[PDB]
Amino acid sequence: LPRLVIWLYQVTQWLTEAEITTEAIWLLCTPEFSGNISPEISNLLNNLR
């Protein structure tokens, strides 16, 4: 529990210093995907093929 507390404090301090929101940092930290093909991916296909 104290390890989690100190990790959370350091993470929040660094995040506030970097001035990043919550869902944005979620997306830019997790390796997950949106769920389907994005319009940008479709444009990449249509400009690559």
């Binding site: 319009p39 940008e40 479709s42 444009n43 249509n46």
Partner: protein
Amino acid sequence: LRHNLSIDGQPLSLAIYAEPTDPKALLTSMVQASQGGSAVLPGTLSLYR
């Protein structure tokens, strides 16, 4: 005495300020659209080179 005031009706307890929720900011983003090409017309072959 019933309403807990002074002799001249001044309230004996200071009314709370009730600080408002205040407004919030608004955001907008970009929107894209995709299209295809037109049908290729068979070029009428001329005689030139």
